Amino acid sequence: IKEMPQPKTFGELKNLPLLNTDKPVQALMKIADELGEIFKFEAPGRVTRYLSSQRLIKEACDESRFDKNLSQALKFVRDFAGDGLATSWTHEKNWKKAHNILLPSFSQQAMKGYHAMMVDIAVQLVQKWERLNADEHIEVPEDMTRLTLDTIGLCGFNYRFNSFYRDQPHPFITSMVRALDEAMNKLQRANPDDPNKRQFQEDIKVMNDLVDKIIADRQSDDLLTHMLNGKDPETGEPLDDENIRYQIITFLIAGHETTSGLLSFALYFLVKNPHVLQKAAEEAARVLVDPVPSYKQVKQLKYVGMVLNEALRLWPTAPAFSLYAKEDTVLGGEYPLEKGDELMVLIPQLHRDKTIWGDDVEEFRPERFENPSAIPQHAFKPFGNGQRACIGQQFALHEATLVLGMMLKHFDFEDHTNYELDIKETLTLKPEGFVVKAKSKKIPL
Amino acid sequence: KEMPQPKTFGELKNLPLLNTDKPVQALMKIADELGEIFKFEAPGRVTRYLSSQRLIKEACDESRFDKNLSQALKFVRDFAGDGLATSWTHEKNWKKAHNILLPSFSQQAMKGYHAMMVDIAVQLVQKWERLNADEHIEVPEDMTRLTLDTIGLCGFNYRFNSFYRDQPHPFITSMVRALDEAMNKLQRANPDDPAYDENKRQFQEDIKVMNDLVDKIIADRSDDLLTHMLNGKDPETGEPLDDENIRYQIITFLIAGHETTSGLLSFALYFLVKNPHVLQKAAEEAARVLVDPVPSYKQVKQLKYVGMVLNEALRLWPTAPAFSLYAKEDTVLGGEYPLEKGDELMVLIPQLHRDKTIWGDDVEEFRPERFENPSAIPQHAFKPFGNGQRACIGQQFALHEATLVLGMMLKHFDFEDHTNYELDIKETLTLKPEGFVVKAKSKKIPL
Numbered sequence: 101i102k103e104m105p106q107p108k109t110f111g112e113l114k115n116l117p118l119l120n121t122d123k124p125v126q127a128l129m130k131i132a133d134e135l136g137e138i139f140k141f142e143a144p145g146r147v148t149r150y151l152s153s154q155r156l157i158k159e160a161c162d163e164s165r166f167d168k169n170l171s172q173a174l175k176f177v178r179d180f181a182g183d184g185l186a187t188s189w190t191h192e193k194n195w196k197k198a199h200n201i202l203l204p205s206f207s208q209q210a211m212k213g214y215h216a217m218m219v220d221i222a223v224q225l226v227q228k229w230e231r232l233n234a235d236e237h238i239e240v241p242e243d244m245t246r247l248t249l250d251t252i253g254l255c256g257f258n259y260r261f262n263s264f265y266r267d268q269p270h271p272f273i274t275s276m277v278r279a280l281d282e283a284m285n286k287l288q289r290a291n292p293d294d295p296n297k298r299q300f301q302e303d304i305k306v307m308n309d310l311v312d313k314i315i316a317d318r319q320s321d322d323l324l325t326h327m328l329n330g331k332d333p334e335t336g337e338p339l340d341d342e343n344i345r346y347q348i349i350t351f352l353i354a355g356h357e358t359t360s361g362l363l364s365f366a367l368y369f370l371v372k373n374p375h376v377l378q379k380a381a382e383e384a385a386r387v388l389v390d391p392v393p394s395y396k397q398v399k400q401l402k403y404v405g406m407v408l409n410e411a412l413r414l415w416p417t418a419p420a421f422s423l424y425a426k427e428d429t430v431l432g433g434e435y436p437l438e439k440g441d442e443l444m445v446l447i448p449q450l451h452r453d454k455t456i457w458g459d460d461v462e463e464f465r466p467e468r469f470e471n472p473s474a475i476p477q478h479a480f481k482p483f484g485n486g487q488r489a490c491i492g493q494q495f496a497l498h499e500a501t502l503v504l505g506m507m508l509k510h511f512d513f514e515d516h517t518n519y520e521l522d523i524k525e526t527l528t529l530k531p532e533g534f535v536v537k538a539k540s541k542k543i544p545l
Numbered sequence: 546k547e548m549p550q551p552k553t554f555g556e557l558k559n560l561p562l563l564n565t566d567k568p569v570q571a572l573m574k575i576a577d578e579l580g581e582i583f584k585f586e587a588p589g590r591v592t593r594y595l596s597s598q599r600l601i602k603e604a605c606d607e608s609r610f611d612k613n614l615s616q617a618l619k620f621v622r623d624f625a626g627d628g629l630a631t632s633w634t635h636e637k638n639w640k641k642a643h644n645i646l647l648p649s650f651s652q653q654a655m656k657g658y659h660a661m662m663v664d665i666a667v668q669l670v671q672k673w674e675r676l677n678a679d680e681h682i683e684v685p686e687d688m689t690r691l692t693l694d695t696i697g698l699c700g701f702n703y704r705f706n707s708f709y710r711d712q713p714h715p716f717i718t719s720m721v722r723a724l725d726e727a728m729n730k731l732q733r734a735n736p737d738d739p740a741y742d743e744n745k746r747q748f749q750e751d752i753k754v755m756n757d758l759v760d761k762i763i764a765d766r767s768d769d770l771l772t773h774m775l776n777g778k779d780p781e782t783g784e785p786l787d788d789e790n791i792r793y794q795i796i797t798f799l800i801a802g803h804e805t806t807s808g809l810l811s812f813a814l815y816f817l818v819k820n821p822h823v824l825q826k827a828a829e830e831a832a833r834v835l836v837d838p839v840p841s842y843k844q845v846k847q848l849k850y851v852g853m854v855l856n857e858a859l860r861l862w863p864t865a866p867a868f869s870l871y872a873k874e875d876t877v878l879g880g881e882y883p884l885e886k887g888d889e890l891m892v893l894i895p896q897l898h899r900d901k902t903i904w905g906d907d908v909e910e911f912r913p914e915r916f917e918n919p920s921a922i923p924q925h926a927f928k929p930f931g932n933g934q935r936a937c938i939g940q941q942f943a944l945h946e947a948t949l950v951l952g953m954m955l956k957h958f959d960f961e962d963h964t965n966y967e968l969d970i971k972e973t974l975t976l977k978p979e980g981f982v983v984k985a986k987s988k989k990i991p992l
């Protein structure tokens with residue numbers, strides 16, 4: 101066997117105070133840098149093991165040996181997302197049922213149907229930036245969140261959040277950050293039930309109000325249509341009212357936060373790497389020859405897609421997923437695991453494995469993705485694994501390629517503050533305070 | 546726009562322009578005169594030769610264009626069948642063999658090949674260490690010895706033992722005379738004339754001799770290329786390759802796995818001895834990195850400047866000089882040249898690599914520093930390994946072998962261009978510098 105490294109401990113609290121930080125993922129990456137491809141992490145009543153090497157993670161992604169686990173973060177999310185797709189166990193009846201019902205909503209016939217509504221929101225973004233005065237700047241993650249929230253609202257539910265008509269974020273968004281802030285605070289409390297609880301219940305209510313409005317309002321053929329009318333071929337059943345509500349909550353959050361982070365990181369890397377920005381902008385100008393992009397044109401933005409994958413390599417905006425051992429098994433030939441033992445896949449560290457990518461892992465080089473065939477299996481996992489992989493991957497990448505393509509077509513960008521990367525962590529990653537200036541190329545829509 | 550076209554010969558159209566020993570260089574001269582695109586007609590065929598990055602970047606759009614079998618590849622297909630290089634993308638055996646063989650070029654596999662590449666590379670170094678004073682090196686001959694032995698050993702655990710022979714193996718000589726016959730046949734108006742019965746008989750003998758080698762390799766039969774051919778299963782269909790296609794893959798990899806790589810090493814050494822400042826910089830890297838008696842896999846990955854030398858040699862003289870494409874549907878090229886579904890294109894790689902709007906005015910100068918940063922190179926400007934899903938499956942194999950061998954050469958010898966060699970590019974289906982010779986003075990560093 102092989103004894104597993106473990107970071108510094110705090111008495112009876114074990115490793116738990118290491119998570120008492122604003123940037124826990126980045127703290128865990130630093131621990132992985134020090135301890136290597138695997139380390140144990142203990143809290144009162146919990147043990148897990150953080151994996152960082154492709155060698156171990158490829159075994160963890162073997163679905164015959166490991167299944168998706170609900171991390172403590174996902175168990176928190178489950179308090180309001182229920183048995184929606186992202187917070188259900190694979191063995192719960194409603195996972196496979198909703199999976200079968202909703203997977204056609206992300207087929208290529210479906211993406212072609214969403215395209216016009218994605219363009220609707222993208223044009224609003226371009227128009228906002230065209231209308232800024234001289235020396236005004238862009239708050240990048242803020243505007244990317246406006247775009248991605250509006251896109252999932254419109255494409256999925258025919259609901260307009262109208263985020264570009266607001267200077268502050270919507271009630272939904274603000275409350276959910278406070279609930280998450282509270283959730284993380286309660287983790288470090290020895291006696292949580294000591295006479296805070298009320299606000300979380302209030303936050304669960306704001307989201308239910310938007311969900312009822314979306315349902316009552318609903319001829320359309322979008323995500324909500326399939327939720328309300330689709331039947332699972334296996335059970336022959338449609339989703340029930342309770343699970344539909346959970347899916348709406350699930351897709352409103354999962355359908356925009358990570359995609360906003362991706363667009364924000366991609367633009368960050370472009371302005372920090374002018375050779376790459378020039379190459380991406382040349383593609384956008386050459387391919388996007390019409391006032392609004394067509395579906396087929398977006399599919400031709402190969403280098404823009406490479407930029408997005410390389411941004412996901414360095415800063416995968418959903419930074420981890422969790423697994424449990426289905427039976428007793430031995431990991432890597434050296435770490436015996438018992439049935440039910442948990443693993444965490446630390447995606448940013450996997451993506452920095454020098455034995456896979458070479459020694460220059462910290463450099464932003466979209467050309468790594470010029471030939472998809474050259475990447476080993478399970479080396480690149482920003483969308484999770486297997487049957488529990490991200491159902492919205494094609495949606496996110498089509499939206500982000502379209503929008504980044506239009507951004508590069510219509511503006512020159514300046515890193516006017518020489519922005520120093522500052523990664524704020526919710527359950528996802530984004531570059532806090534990232535601002536740029538955009539000079540219009542004066543190309544009409 | 547009306548497409549330029551070179552001079553014609555009546556009903557023979559442009560075909561007599563290819564009746565030359567150096568057709569690629571003839572086509573480059575035509576491209577120099579006519580520009581980024583020209584029509585080329587023969588009896589029963591029309592194609593268009595592209596030379597600018599502006600047009601070739603569109604041709605590399607896989608939604609609009611797919612790999613075409615040129616007449617040269619149709620010739621190779623007479624004995625390479627539906628192997629990887631001569632199959633159409635839509636033939637079942639292309640994707641099937643692609644999925645089965647791609648793991649044979651993963652980095653776990655390359656680490657497995659490294660020791661066998663070192664085996665052959667040491668034989669090269671020892672041959673040159675053992676030359677007497679004032680003896681010289683026949684460069685393309687020894688590079689072909691090395692690359693043939695390397696693909697034989699790494700791919701099939703078969704030793705050609707080329708360093709034990711003063712003349713090439715029979716199949717190599719067999720290969721070229723078959724090609725010579727094929728290229729003569731282009732010019733024949735009546736190929737089924739009885740006057741060419743003798744020519745056909747010899748072609749079949751050649752296909753037999755190469756096939757005799759394949760039988761020997763299979764009869765002999767590790768975790769190598771042939772292992773995957775015989776045991777791998779395509780994840781999509783769940784099927785292994787059948788015996789007939791395996792034979793075609795062996796033929797394919799025996800040829801594709803060594804000829805272009807020998808040309809690359811030969812051109813790289815040519816450019817180094819013609820550019821002493823570059824040679825000194827590469828030799829300094831080799832001395833700094835290769836600190837052990839034999840290079841490690843990791844050390845080869847660290848020969849950064851040597852890798853740039855190889856890419857710059859591929860820029861000026863890409864040893865696979867062209868590839869062919871066809872339009873998947875009606876489309877317009879460059880906004881001005883309308884194409885119909887099925888219309889064919891030829892990508893003239895040496896001319897693409899001389900596009901002054903991409904590389905600057907010094908395109909003919911050998912400057913490996915052009916390749917310091919791949920992000921600084923425009924998209925589709927550099928295509929020595931083809932394009933897209935039909936790009937060279939052996940690219941990393943070729944570059945690892947050539948970097949290892951060139952690194953060891955630079956570590957162990959000083960080189961002299963003692964004849965002031967005048968570049969003379971011999972054309973098969975690939976390019977190589979004929980008659981290139983050097984003298985090597987050992988630095989007396991043991992292995």
Ligand code: HEM
Binds near residue numbers: 185356416418
């Ligand atoms: C760049 C953007 C995105 C990233 C990086 C991302 C990442 C991920 C990851 C890593 C998982 C697996 C999590 C786990 O195993 O616990 C996942 C699952 C999921 N994602 Fe995404 N996602 C993105 C965009 C989207 C979009 C646009 C949607 C909806 C339109 C979406 C909806 C979902 C859902 C429903 C699941 C759960 C799937 C299931 O278990 O059946 N995501 N995502």
Ligand code: HEM
Binds near residue numbers: 612643797803869934
């Ligand atoms: C410097 C050395 C090399 C060069 C310049 C080169 C060049 C090329 C080019 C341009 C193509 C595409 C041809 C077309 O589109 O018709 C190609 C394909 C191919 N090459 Fe290479 N090659 C080299 C080394 C190798 C090696 C070492 C191997 C085998 C170990 C190999 C095997 C193949 C195969 C099998 C294909 C067909 C791939 C497919 O269509 O699936 N080549 N090569």
Ligand SMILES: O=C(CCCCCn1ccnc1)N[C@@H](Cc1ccccc1)C(=O)O
Binds near residue numbers: 119141142174419444
């Ligand atoms: O590491 C992480 C971050 C994972 C969140 C990703 C969420 N996502 C998925 C798709 N889109 C977002 N989380 C651990 C922390 C912990 C470890 C031990 C003990 C207590 C807490 C956990 O939640 O269990």
Ligand SMILES: O=C(CCCCCn1ccnc1)N[C@@H](Cc1ccccc1)C(=O)O
Binds near residue numbers: 587618867975
């Ligand atoms: O230009 C070429 C040379 C291409 C050879 C590439 C061979 N290779 C590929 C991978 N490794 C080697 N070939 C044309 C010539 C022709 C044009 C018009 C009419 C008749 C013949 C053709 O073969 O079609």
